Structure 1
């Protein structure tokens, strides 16, 4: 016996894609959540700007400024955080205060929601994620921009915390690269990294955009929450463009197989396993260099599973040239975490082979479900090879 799994993988109702692709409820939910954060963040920034402009209008004391702060949504910060915001607004010099009054936060979602490879969570504790970056158009800087790193972080945190304060079952979490809202009961969290981008360039492109119906990566700076290094050059559009380009170059099946590999990962580890981006990059390298047939994703997945251990062993380069660190280290550097990852990857082609030569459709299903978990239950998707 030899079985074909193309329908197992791709059927949009009962097949693996049918089980991975977010429901409408889930997808509209994530969009509603993102919209809610965007609205509050713009509101919080206006409230702060309103105070700034009152300082510009007439020299207000520091005590008056603390008073005004305490009545805005910034009141959801800690009392030390609140006075920190008041101090920063009070201390801003004329140049910085003008720039701040010009600042309007802009938004852009990154990650799997944007790559369109966001899977429904499998194991308990696994969550849907969405990252919506907040971008701050400001003059080009080195060291520190006119509008402080500190002030920008506090206002974004104030936005998130004001939303948490309005929602039972929401929780705020501060991370090194973002603020986070988690809604455990909805298996959802939203990340908000903050970026500085050149203002003059942003304005120029925006005018052309509206007239005709991207920014220079080197000056896109990710804010870091702690440590000596407040900013780092990091442009999420690099990876985003690379992946979209890869999809065009390889074909529409690229997104499906990346979903399958992420689903494999979610089934093999409740927590941990290779990052999604290392799997996508390794898969892209394989499909770029190995002949395969998109009309049979059963066969294509066997090709992928066969070549992934070699990809990971030699180490997986980031498609972003400016990242020094690989997405995954080469063998001579592997510790326990990577060794565990190598063992799982080496097992995959064995699993897919045993499914292919199972005695029946029901056993073929059980065997391939060792790789992806028991999500697909309709064994009739599995057909005899011709």
Structure 2
């Protein structure tokens, strides 16, 4: 029968969905610049703290003098009690802890969609691009305190926020965050302890709760996804972008996580025949199978995760039910677009899935299927 084809609608890098979703080089460079600012300040803060520790190694300074020294560094941007705590922790170090600290130089690695190239331009007002730049503290396997490390990273991020109008700090359970509302951007800074020189010894720092650390190596997800792209093909990054774009269009705030969409989509494309020469059909195939993937619970590609990426249906409350509803509707949307009574209606319908981003109906062509 006659059908509308959406392959260019999806893939066209001029003004198709890929063209609308991929960051411009100016945006990508802006994110790399922001990343560099954070990394340099974090390096500096640790050097400033280490300078104080060096002074105390040389002579057992009074608490008051150590406090004075702290107040001249970037740590002056923490609260008074936090400054006290930093000075107290430096004061309380024994020779071994201090020697270990003097040998610590933070390292950095970006995780998430900036790293494996699936970061979309944000859609709705309020939505922001994220760059996830982790800070890594090489230490003996378990020697340098959870409290001090978090205070120093917080000092770095808070000192930058104090110097830049329109920057805000947010403490999250798994990271420090700088939000730049006007740039529709935030940078997330998770902190890890790793061995000094094996994913079992990569420990993510948690801010509050019964645990200070949890073993969660972001490299596991990065390698899993990069390997999946190689295995499945160049269309995997594209259809993950498209599913994330659908999520951004259906929910202002909320919806399924990006990682849950990636995991379910990889599962489907590993197991169901599809055709990269028609990403319209491929998206319909993915859409038909996502509800079953999500209803049974979406497993993490990291087997050590304590919970699935999305819960099985007997655990659903209103939010998961809403996500299932939208997932169920998606293949119907795509099917209806395919059989629309005109090109303009085909576009209107498929944009009910991905939002009114693509406006060029010449990317939709009359086909047979």
TM-score band (shorter)? Answer: over 0.9
Deviation at 1:330, TM superposition (A): 1.3
Can you list the C-alpha shifts for 1:252-308, whole angstroms capped at 9, x where unaligned? 000000000000000000000000111110000000000001111011001001111
Q: Secondary structure at the match of 2:108?
A: strand
* Pick aligned residue for 2:254 from 272, 291, 304: 272
Rounded to whole Å, the distance in 1 between the matches of 2:296 and 2:212 is 33
Deviation at 1:41, TM superposition (A): 0.3
Can you list the C-alpha shifts for 1:311-343, whole angstroms capped at 9, x where unaligned? 111111111010121111112222211111110
Deviation at 1:63, TM superposition (A): 0.8
Can you list the C-alpha shifts for 1:221-275, whole angstroms capped at 9, x where unaligned? 0111112211111101111110001000000000000000000000000000000
Q: Secondary structure at the match of 2:84?
A: helix
Q: Secondary structure at the match of 2:349?
A: helix
Q: Secondary structure at the match of 2:170?
A: strand
Deviation at 1:92, TM superposition (A): 0.3
Unaligned runs of 5+ in 2: none
Can you list the C-alpha shifts for 1:346-371, whole angstroms capped at 9, x where unaligned? 00111001100111111100010000
Rounded to whole Å, the distance in 2 between the matches of 1:383 and 1:286 is 27
Residue 318 of structure 2 is aligned to residue 317 of structure 1: no
Q: Secondary structure at the match of 1:95?
A: helix
Deviation at 1:25, TM superposition (A): 1.5
Q: Secondary structure at the match of 2:163?
A: coil
Show the counterpart of 1:208. none
Can you list the C-alpha shifts for 1:24-47, whole angstroms capped at 9, x where unaligned? 111111100000000000000000
Rounded to whole Å, the distance in 2 between the matches of 1:199 and 1:71 is 30
Question: Between Structure 1 and Structure 2, how many residues are aligned?
Answer: 366
Can you list the C-alpha shifts for 1:114-147, whole angstroms capped at 9, x where unaligned? 1210000000110010110000000001xxxx21
Deviation at 1:23, TM superposition (A): 1.1
* Pick aligned residue for 1:298 from 274, 280, 286: 280
Show the counterpart of 2:357. 375
Q: Secondary structure at the match of 1:248?
A: helix
Deviation at 1:59, TM superposition (A): 1.4
Q: Secondary structure at the match of 1:165?
A: helix
Q: Secondary structure at the match of 1:112?
A: coil
Matches within 5 A, 1:204-283: 217-283=199-265
Deviation at 1:12, TM superposition (A): 0.1
Unaligned runs of 5+ in 1: 201-216
Deviates more, 1:257-266 or 1:330-339: 330-339
Deviation at 1:58, TM superposition (A): 1.2
Tell me the TM-score normalized by structure 2: 0.98
Tell me the TM-score normalized by structure 1: 0.94
Rounded to whole Å, the distance in 2 between the matches of 1:323 and 1:33 is 30
Show the counterpart of 1:212. none
Rounded to whole Å, the distance in 2 between the matches of 1:317 and 1:225 is 25
Show the counterpart of 1:184. 181
Rounded to whole Å, the distance in 1 between the matches of 2:328 and 2:174 is 33
Rounded to whole Å, the distance in 2 between the matches of 1:13 and 1:346 is 31
Deviation at 1:62, TM superposition (A): 0.9
Deviation at 1:86, TM superposition (A): 0.5
Q: Secondary structure at the match of 2:115?
A: helix
Rounded to whole Å, the distance in 2 between the matches of 1:71 and 1:266 is 44
Q: Secondary structure at the match of 1:347?
A: helix
Rounded to whole Å, the distance in 2 between the matches of 1:331 and 1:104 is 46
Show the counterpart of 1:204. none
Rounded to whole Å, the distance in 1 between the matches of 2:188 and 2:102 is 26
Rounded to whole Å, the distance in 2 between the matches of 1:266 and 1:119 is 10
Rounded to whole Å, the distance in 2 between the matches of 1:66 and 1:324 is 41
Q: Secondary structure at the match of 2:118?
A: coil
Rounded to whole Å, the distance in 1 between the matches of 2:311 and 2:72 is 50
Structure 1 segments (4+ residues) deviating >2 Å: none
Structural RMSD (CA): 0.7
* Pick aligned residue for 1:149 from 125, 146, 151: 146
